[PDB]
Amino acid sequence: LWDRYVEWLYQHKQLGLFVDVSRMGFTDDFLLQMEPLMQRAFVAMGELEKGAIANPDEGRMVGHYWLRDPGLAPNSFLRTKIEKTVDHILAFSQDIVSGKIKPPSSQAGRFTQILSIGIGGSSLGPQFVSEALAPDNPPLKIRFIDNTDPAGIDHQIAQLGEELKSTLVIVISKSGGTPETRNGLLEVQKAFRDAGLDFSKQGVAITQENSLLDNTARIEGWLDRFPMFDWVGGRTSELSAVGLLPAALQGIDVKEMLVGAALMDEETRNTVVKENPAALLALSWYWATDGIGSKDMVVLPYKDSLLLLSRYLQQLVMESLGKEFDLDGNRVNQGLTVYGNKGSTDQHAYIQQLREGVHNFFVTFIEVLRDRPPGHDWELEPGVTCGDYLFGMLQGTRSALYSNDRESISVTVEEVTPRAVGALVALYERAVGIYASLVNINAYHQPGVEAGKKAAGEVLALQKRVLTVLNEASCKDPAEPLTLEQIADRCHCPEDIEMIYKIIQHMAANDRALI
Amino acid sequence: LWDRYVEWLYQHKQLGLFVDVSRMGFTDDFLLQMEPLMQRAFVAMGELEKGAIANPDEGRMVGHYWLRDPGLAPNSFLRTKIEKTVDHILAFSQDIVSGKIKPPSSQAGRFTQILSIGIGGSSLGPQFVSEALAPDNPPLKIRFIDNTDPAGIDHQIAQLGEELKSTLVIVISKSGGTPETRNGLLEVQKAFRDAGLDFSKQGVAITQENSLLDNTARIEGWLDRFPMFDWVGGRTSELSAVGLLPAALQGIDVKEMLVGAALMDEETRNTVVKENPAALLALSWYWATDGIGSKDMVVLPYKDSLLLLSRYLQQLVMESLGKEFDLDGNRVNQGLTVYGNKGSTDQHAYIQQLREGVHNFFVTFIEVLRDRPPGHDWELEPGVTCGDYLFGMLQGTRSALYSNDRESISVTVEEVTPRAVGALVALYERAVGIYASLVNINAYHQPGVEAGKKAAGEVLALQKRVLTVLNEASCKDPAEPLTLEQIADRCHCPEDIEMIYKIIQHMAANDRALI
């Protein structure tokens, strides 16, 4: 196992990032069998960066690698557009932090809080970087609205209290038609009117050009607007204005994030697989799951700051790879389940099943060598610090798992830095893209979310027919009570009886119907 | 499907809790065949409540059901100690909230912050209950130290800033020998001594009587001590002093929490399976996983206050059920993987794979009827409030998943109240215990977690042996650089060379070695 660890250890000189796959049991012939498919993945990825249509389903380019390397963008209108947005974010961020741009009237004078409204990649990304890289007492605290739950938004407004007068609200949506994001903005604007505050003088929009949210922010005259591009999927939009602006608004060096991702993309373009860390991750995923997602990917970061990494990877991996149809139309239910929280906390949670329970998984440890800010280290016992225990739990768990034939990958960074986090985002973005080529699927469209989108619209459409059929009882002289079968036939939706029951069950609990 | 929904719906009138397993496709042959196994679980559960040795592997009693009904304790001493603790918690929390028990000197004159130091069930429970029931502006805000990460502990201390003078530190450990909890206590005491504070006048211990931590807090004179009993496992300790104290310290009605838990356990004793809601969950789990955990349980609560439900359920399910051996010595690698976050946020994360990807899962929806505090409900567009979208998202996902043969369970509460959370906790405790009887495993011991703790001790003992070899080589006047092979040989363990490399790598990054 020592000879295997030395033969396969990947080390990156500059970033201080390491990839260990020795605890993956891939065989000799498996490497030769996967060599032709890996070459096809590198050529397909090479034409993706050149500007080819790598998302045939939506007819769009896939250029989230240009966000960190503007030169690789194909035309001049794109290289300068990407560069002017980074400078635009840096200029506007430093104006908010230094207090040059103020709210109209607040106690602190400057902005001190951030209310980012967004869902999917518009929040999972920014939540991950914020918890990973923000200072303890940052220039601006941050809160998130990532749902359409009324109680959650009310709770955020109540805790915000009187600092709403110093809150900079950020609305992140490509079109402004996302039901959750629009609901959030509508609820917050209602709260700004109840406090007698002009939302426009405290609002920022991150949106695609000439969209419903861009027009609203332009017409209502919000503070600023930041562009989103259609070749940047929300799944891989962390290094765009989606993540760069909120991160820079908390004193985070986002330029170093772009640099770390840039150095990472150079290593992933290597055609020798053993020296390609994105290929090594994709190989191990392929080996552990037999290429059909037979096992789950358990992400175990042994750092409190990386707690939100796994649910960030839940979108990047499961939504990119959970495709029903192969690129040639054949029914192939691909995917790669991801879960996990944090070490060593998860050892007192579900490692009982991981070690001796059902073997339906493989682990990916994320290790961070530096333990604490410099000048805070001290020994708890002779020769051992508080951080040495954290190091020991990971190594003992890695050892206790492999001893029972449970495989694992180890990814190691020296310190959780803007540069390293940007490298980790770039690493998994390419590894997902390479893996989709191995299983022959399009990683950049989202066909599976459409079915829930229509079924949810039909429920809201059914609710209005229920109210329409009911207001007969409210306003017709043959005032009478309708049975469930009677609401259904008059709605001309008889087979929807069950949904009608759940609809009136919800309205009765919110003082909108009587039973 | 409507007829199946009407036939199988379970309502618990007093609690307002519903269970819908109509979208589980178990046949009548399944119900007929599982009836002998189900009745055996009801008898075993009765013997467990009466005081039998339910944890056979450790020779202990399982009595978390006595925490909510002290009358059914096997003796009057156990009944007395349970009720004296609840009275003790209430009187101490009321005196903390009202300010009758003060910090030695603070700006507010009252305790304002809670620092809960605990691991596993000592934190997951209090974290879940806090986010679900704490008021918007509680009498005391709460923070959790649940790891041995020094950066995270220093982070919480830095954010706490000056309010450390008015922080109530709670230390939760059974014997006080848990390494994570011990290191967190040492780090907090260092911060208290650096600020000139005395930890004894702001510290509370939740421990087993006459343990190392119980004797220390009694001799050093901490604020107060609360018992932790040996017949209560970590993952079923939420309604004991572990969860009741941090909850009551935030103004949460812990009495109603016990009421709902007791009300729930009365129904989960019903012998009729169709009206035993713990049996309805256990059967649906057994069906979807075919008894051997071949499908994950995705938990999607559609409410922000229930975000930490799956992390709590991850411990209760995957640590009770992931057992390698049957109760008869047979090797069955049981298990039931659990993950999930919240709706509708997870719709834009991995419902893509849930809808059309790998069919290796089943969903459990948690629906809440009351979507908003009274007086806050308003209509975004004509005839639809913000909660109608939340409700439509859940029904749309449940429908879109079932169309593609993805089965699901629906749990409905009227509102996330103290009584509802206690009942929902008690529902899953009994369902897990019942499921363990079906697969003939012991759900109350943790044999699989020791191999990581033991291997973690071997690494630290190796580090101290490595440090002895390095310090000998560094205290020669002709200083002596050593290689990995040399270090492993002077430690007289050449096979451990891989662990020595990681020890030196982690030490070099913390300025404790040079390369």
TrEMBL record, chains A, B:
This is Glucose-6-phosphate isomerase. The chain holds residues 83 to 597 of 620 of the full protein. The lineage of its organism: Eukaryota, Viridiplantae, Streptophyta, Embryophyta, Tracheophyta. One of its GO terms (cellular component) is cytosol. It comes from Triticum aestivum (Wheat). Belongs to the GPI family. One of its GO terms (biological process) is glycolytic process. Pathway: Carbohydrate degradation; glycolysis; D-glyceraldehyde 3-phosphate and glycerone phosphate from D-glucose: step 2/4. GO terms for molecular function: carbohydrate derivative binding; glucose-6-phosphate isomerase activity; monosaccharide binding. Its EC number is 5.3.1.9. It is an enzyme of class 5 (isomerase). Keywords: Gluconeogenesis, Glycolysis, Isomerase. It catalyses: alpha-D-glucose 6-phosphate = beta-D-fructose 6-phosphate.
